[PDB]
Design an enzyme around this catalytic site. Sequence first.
Site, PDB file in Angstrom:
ATOM      1  N   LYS A   1       8.075  20.637 -11.943  1.00  0.00           N
ATOM      2  CA  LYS A   1       8.900  21.576 -12.722  1.00  0.00           C
ATOM      3  C   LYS A   1       9.846  20.822 -13.624  1.00  0.00           C
ATOM      4  O   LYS A   1       9.384  20.097 -14.484  1.00  0.00           O
ATOM      5  CB  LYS A   1       9.589  22.529 -11.753  1.00  0.00           C
TER       6      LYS A   1
ATOM      7  N   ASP B   1      15.157  22.872  -0.721  1.00  0.00           N
ATOM      8  CA  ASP B   1      14.279  22.745  -1.880  1.00  0.00           C
ATOM      9  C   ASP B   1      15.118  23.001  -3.129  1.00  0.00           C
ATOM     10  O   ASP B   1      15.529  24.138  -3.389  1.00  0.00           O
ATOM     11  CB  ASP B   1      13.114  23.726  -1.760  1.00  0.00           C
TER      12      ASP B   1
ATOM     13  N   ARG C   1       0.815  -1.212   0.000  1.00  0.00           N
ATOM     14  CA  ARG C   1       0.000   0.000   0.000  1.00  0.00           C
ATOM     15  C   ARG C   1       0.854   1.269   0.000  1.00  0.00           C
ATOM     16  O   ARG C   1       0.506   2.253  -0.655  1.00  0.00           O
ATOM     17  CB  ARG C   1      -0.943   0.014   1.205  1.00  0.00           C
TER      18      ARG C   1
ATOM     19  N   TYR D   1       9.184  29.826  -1.870  1.00  0.00           N
ATOM     20  CA  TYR D   1       8.036  29.690  -2.750  1.00  0.00           C
ATOM     21  C   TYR D   1       6.746  29.923  -1.971  1.00  0.00           C
ATOM     22  O   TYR D   1       6.624  29.542  -0.803  1.00  0.00           O
ATOM     23  CB  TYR D   1       8.057  28.305  -3.389  1.00  0.00           C
TER      24      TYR D   1
END
Lengths: 386, 386, 386, 386
Positions: free
Chosen positions: D199, D174, D49, D102
């Site tokens: 992106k 990031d 799962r 962001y």
Amino acid sequence: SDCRTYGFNTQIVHAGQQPDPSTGALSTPIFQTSTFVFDSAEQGAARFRLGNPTTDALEKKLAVLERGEAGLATASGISAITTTLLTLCQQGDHIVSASAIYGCTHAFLSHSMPKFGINVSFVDAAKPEEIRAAMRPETKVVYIETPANPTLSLVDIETVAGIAHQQGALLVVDNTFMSPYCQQPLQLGADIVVHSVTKYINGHGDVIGGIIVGKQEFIDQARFVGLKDITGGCMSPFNAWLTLRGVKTLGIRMERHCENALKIARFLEGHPSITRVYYPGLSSHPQYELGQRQMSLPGGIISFEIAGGLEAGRRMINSVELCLLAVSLGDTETLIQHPASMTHSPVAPEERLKAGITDGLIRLSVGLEDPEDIINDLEHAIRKAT
Amino acid sequence: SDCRTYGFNTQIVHAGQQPDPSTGALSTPIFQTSTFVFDSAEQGAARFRLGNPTTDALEKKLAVLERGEAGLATASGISAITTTLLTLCQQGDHIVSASAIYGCTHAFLSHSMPKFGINVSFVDAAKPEEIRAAMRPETKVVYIETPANPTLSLVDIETVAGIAHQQGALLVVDNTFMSPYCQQPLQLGADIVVHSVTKYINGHGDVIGGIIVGKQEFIDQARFVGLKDITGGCMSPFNAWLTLRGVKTLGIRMERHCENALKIARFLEGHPSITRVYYPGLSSHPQYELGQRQMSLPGGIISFEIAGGLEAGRRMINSVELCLLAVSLGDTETLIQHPASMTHSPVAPEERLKAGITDGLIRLSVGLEDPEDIINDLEHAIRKAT
Amino acid sequence: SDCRTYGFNTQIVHAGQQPDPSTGALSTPIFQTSTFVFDSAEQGAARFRLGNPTTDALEKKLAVLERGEAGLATASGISAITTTLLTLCQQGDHIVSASAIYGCTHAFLSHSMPKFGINVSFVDAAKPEEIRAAMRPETKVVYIETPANPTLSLVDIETVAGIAHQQGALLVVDNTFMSPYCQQPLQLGADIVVHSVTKYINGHGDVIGGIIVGKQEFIDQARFVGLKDITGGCMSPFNAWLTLRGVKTLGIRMERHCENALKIARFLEGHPSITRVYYPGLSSHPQYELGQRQMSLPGGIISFEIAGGLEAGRRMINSVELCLLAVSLGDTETLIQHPASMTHSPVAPEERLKAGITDGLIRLSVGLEDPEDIINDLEHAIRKAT
Amino acid sequence: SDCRTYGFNTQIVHAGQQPDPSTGALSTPIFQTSTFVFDSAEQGAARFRLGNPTTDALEKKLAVLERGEAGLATASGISAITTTLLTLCQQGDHIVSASAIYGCTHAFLSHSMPKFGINVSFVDAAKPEEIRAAMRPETKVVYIETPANPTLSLVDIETVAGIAHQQGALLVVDNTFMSPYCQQPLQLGADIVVHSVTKYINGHGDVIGGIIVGKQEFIDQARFVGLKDITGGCMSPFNAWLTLRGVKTLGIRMERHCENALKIARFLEGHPSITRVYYPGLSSHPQYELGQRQMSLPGGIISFEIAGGLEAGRRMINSVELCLLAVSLGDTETLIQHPASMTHSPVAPEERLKAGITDGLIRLSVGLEDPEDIINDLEHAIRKAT
Ligand SMILES: *Cc1c(COP(=O)(O)O)cnc(C)c1O
Ligand SMILES: *Cc1c(COP(=O)(O)O)cnc(C)c1O
Ligand SMILES: *Cc1c(COP(=O)(O)O)cnc(C)c1O
Ligand SMILES: *Cc1c(COP(=O)(O)O)cnc(C)c1O
């Protein structure tokens, strides 16, 4: 153990499929690949593009469901038909075909085949004697479709198979309208079954594809010569996976399609604005008893004639609110069409009439909605139109 | 404004595509449908299965890239070829074809077409005079492929087009090996281009499909007769969407394929265990100057012969660690094959030799890996094998 | 006109969906995009990633089916639950939850929420007085699931909703086991319904996803704060399209699941090797009459205890030939599991016993196969095991 | 043998992937399943799962590319960020975050985390001393993004990692803007890298998704606690397969993005109507030398200020013909946006100014088109606007 021993609903769910041995994945993986890799030069020589594990599962399932040896998936229903017939026939051969056949099939038989030197005789296949009378020493194939557009006439498969075989020909049956849940032509003596899976087998209005079922010896030729060297009409693995997914519910879908269609057909037969209703489930159908022997259910398609001809039929289909105007069939949504104003509008009226297409004829593909809602929509549009 | 005015990389990204007018979605939506619905009987008659908005975008893009009027997507490269030729030819017609053609094409031309009464003459298309000498009053088509397996020989498209046209025939060019980024046969006078998009145009080894590009008048016939009434070889919308996605990077992919291939070809030409290297980018190629005029890049495919014949070639491909053993081409991974031990193993050695397949011939589809890694893998396997 | 007026099967097929206005495509297009484009700076400012036209159709359909205002699709059932509760609760808030809840939900409530300062009281929700007694001034949410694993006990939704509302809390109901076809918690006073669409709503064992249905004001917060600023659990457009496709057959699937399950439950209740059978369709179920008022069908899930405890249960599931060993539910295939030997094997036996998991308990997700085949497989394995 | 030894382009193509052992399929199969089946009770207990073979290939590939131990795919970039931070932090913990982050990340850090009792200090991460000064005994994580919107300022990863580690905190970076092709934060001492694969990593504008790369011990917690028990943000297998397909061309895409962006940045820097150009490839960039050490390429994103403020920027983006107006980045098409008229239009001008968003600031995501076409389009719109 062996899916061929289980009941038909069990086969529908399980046949041709198994958990992935390497991962346990229950869903058939989508082998969306073009390239297969070899572990060695020797394995490359041993294996020696035309197959795929996802598509193989679909082919094996449909072979089980039609009680045939082997299956072959294709890019479209028409590709199933042409891959079959172009594999079997060459210049100088002959085909006897029903006249009441699906449109695109007709153009292939009436124009394409003769341009390859393959002659075709068209007959009324509801009269088996016309099939016999048309056979020639060169006849390789008898081609039939049942039920057949546009009035849902029938062809007696077992009787035609016997005629074809006595005269040395194969019988090919287009079983699209019925699906294997409702009719099994190979069990009645046909040699090859073809389907547009675009209709009921996929059932969800989102796949164009075909399938061929028959003896392993023929299917091998349809694959390694017909697909490889003539039509190139392979089915994509994603389309095969979607069709596998759609056919999981074939049994419950056909049951509901046919239960709804019988309710709607009885409603239409009681309506004083409807002159005729064509449905194999009605006792007034010209070949009703044949249908009861040959078909396990009467199907999900209805044709009917509305009072007032062309303009009433146009006004009726412009007045439905739930039924959708479309030329396909076998989807989960109810679809309706009026050939004389839609598809056959430029065709001359007397030419339409020979094709069994009267000005008031409406064709209905009954969906999975509540039958009361479909009936109320039909009644609403019929009342306004008449 | 009009994508036909922009540079080729811009066309690759944008041609045939636009944000969805109704939603602004940048990606072309996947119109995975079989059914289209009408708003009225009148709209149904006006519109009167063979088209799809996703596939239309792919067809329009490839038409822009090949500088043709119109495109037609198909279920496979072979279906692009057979849909084209079966649309153009009928019983009694003639085709002049190159002999150095892709395998499956050869079976269609050598066995299937003659069984439909369409005769085919095979010639050495590197010698345009052999094409001229084979033409007949019945010749409808000259069929060529360039570069051609297995030694990457070339055909002079502009010269053959002139010959074909003077004698009243169409020229059909299989441009699969090059892609429109490297060769544009319609700009050199060909009438029709066909591709297996299975190779470079999709480029990601996960789509089987074909495309046809030519005049609108021919493409309309290939669609409404060839696909509809002969092969049924439609491309599925998901396959069209994946090919649209793959072709976005066609320019940068072909640049890297060819940059890598030239490095590898020069390495192989310097290696004393390699007797021959076939690559249009090497000045020793028999038709090098023709390739420089006709091709913008020399391509991503290399053939070469290893010292020691059959057993050395088998030992070499069993010794690579990065190159993958496969029979396809145009993928992002480097692929290698040894025909005499893999594909053509049951073929008699002298029969292989006539086909240009020597015992030591290796074919290489150069991928997007670091060229130093590909070269080191080849050197490793060549050293062990020899 | 308005799908909210039609019968439930009609809504299942049609609600939230319409032919594509720009193309007429019947299938909802797959808007597999991340980027949406603006026609102008002004349109960009006007529109001001969290929505998608394909997913919107699924959300609107499920809102119609549950009789809620709005829907929100998510990456998983657990994401539907956590996006809901993390949107509603902050540090210092309290939740009253049923103890008989699905496993992963339990870890989120018992460990994750308290680490964010959100306290949770677990109660026996079959006893509404325990819910009332656990409520605090800080209680924002009462959380229940019905029927509930592992013995298919029930919770009285209308009674619990009244209690929760009198004390100023929202009622959230996990309706996964039932689907909207069999139970409609919002119609009984719940404020928010969550589903794992991984189970019956998709139904084809090939999608992991969730959905939330409730008031527009709450759903807007779950979307623009919960998904955007907390879980990021968006559903992909392809998963939404597959769920739309699966839910087309929800009505006919649930009818067959429940018809099969009732036959199997009666067979098991007659079998002398089976000590107990838990199924809401059996009159011996402790809350049978409540189930008859609250549920339109008794569901497709059965639990039962086999004679002989742990080793008999292990031997039974190792002896089935048609039922598949798996821990999911709601698929078209019949699935079986033995928690004490499979999932809860490392859990101490007395700890399992408090969780209602006895050594002989078997859970069965009844599929769409022929019920005679399922019964014969169960009988075969039960006979061998006992 | 081991993909970690090969060059970066080779790893991009091959890492995490291999021909399917059972079929030889080169493409990673799409394991579009929710259910995995066990062969026995014992195998069920053994597996006990949250995983999938397709998604596993993507996770292993990105782990190789970032030089991390393990990867974890998610439903979105924001889900990668929140699954990471909600796994690491609980009530009473502290995070030091860059302010230039962001947008959606900012709402999660500024509102969601404090409501769970997790406090966040925002600092100017271009000044590492501000990071040090903000650290507390409770600080678990330092969170940075580089380059950072909206002026492409940089953060010195190696220096910040050293500061964070000396004070006992993890560094999370990031790396979306760069992709592993251009920057490798783990090689510079970061502990965890997160990406929006929406992106560049996918690159084709048709996938929303995220990825997390780090130590196996952390990734196991992010998977079995973060995804399972908090966000539920699993990536669907089809999205993983599309991202695997997109990342095949990451190297050639980033090379072309950056080659095009440098040409465009130099053009803009020479244009008298452009007051400022922000691009790490220009020597005038405030942190140019840091970028040269930390980044292998300067990236595909440019910001620039047009003469004439708000109305000139609005007129410019309304005058482009090739660039598309959109708020995403990293696609194959060139995308442009004017925040002060589009995204931040309702934001007060002086509030925009503090966020580094001047009235004339334009952001450009440079695509794969011909750079001459992009430059001519920009020049056309700049000339008209000014
Ligand atoms: C629709 C249909 C076909 C054609 O199938 P396609 O998949 O559309 O090519 C052939 N025969 C029958 C009876 C059909 O209904
Ligand atoms: C692979 C190939 C073909 C066949 O295309 P398919 O998509 O595999 O049917 C035809 N011509 C050439 C030159 C090819 O390389
Ligand atoms: C399976 C299930 C869940 C979890 O859903 P996922 O999609 O697997 O995350 C939650 N509640 C119930 C009742 C379930 O059966
Ligand atoms: C787009 C982006 C994100 C958000 O990713 P999603 O997949 O849209 O949720 C996070 N960080 C950066 C730097 C981004 O560009």
